[PDB]
UniProtKB/Swiss-Prot annotation:
Its job: Regulatory subunit of the ATP-dependent BRF-1 and BRF-5 ISWI chromatin remodeling complexes, which form ordered nucleosome arrays on chromatin and facilitate access to DNA during DNA-templated processes such as DNA replication, transcription, and repair. Both complexes regulate the spacing of nucleosomes along the chromatin and have the ability to slide mononucleosomes to the center of a DNA template. The BRF-1 ISWI chromatin remodeling complex has a lower ATP hydrolysis rate than the BRF-5 ISWI chromatin remodeling complex.
The family this protein is said to belong to: Belongs to the WAL family.
Ranges that cross the membrane: none
Entry comment describing in which tissues the protein is expressed: Expressed at varying levels in several tissues, whereas a smaller transcript was expressed specifically in testis.
Complexes and interactors: Component of the BRF-1 ISWI chromatin remodeling complex, at least composed of SMARCA1 and BAZ2B, which regulates the spacing of histone octamers on the DNA template to facilitate access to DNA. Within the BRF-1 ISWI chromatin remodeling complex interacts with SMARCA1; the interaction is direct. Component of the BRF-5 ISWI chromatin remodeling complex, at least composed of SMARCA5/SNF2H and BAZ2B, which regulates the spacing of histone octamers on the DNA template to facilitate access to DNA.
Protein name in UniProt: Bromodomain adjacent to zinc finger domain protein 2B
Amino acid sequence: SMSVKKPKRDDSKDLALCSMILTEMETHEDAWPFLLPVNLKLVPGYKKVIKKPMDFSTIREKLSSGQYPNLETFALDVRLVFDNCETFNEDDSDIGRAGHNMRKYFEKKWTDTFK
């Protein structure tokens, strides 16, 4: 509350560490469905159904331009990519399986780096 603060957690390396995580997601072999924005002209249903599209290239540009206020807003966008994928793709499809694998990979790196 006013003039009463918990001890200051060091956040000075968060930007660099989120960039390292994002590089590791970019270079994973199962990243291919997620590297670029879904083409809304060419994929029927996507525009109406997925209210907030997100992809790794869009996260990279937001990261690089100071559009994440803290490390939690960065994790929310990464998770959005996988939540969108599960909304639109069957579990038993190449893209459906890719999304599950990448979400697993991300959540471990996240815990090991920050928790």
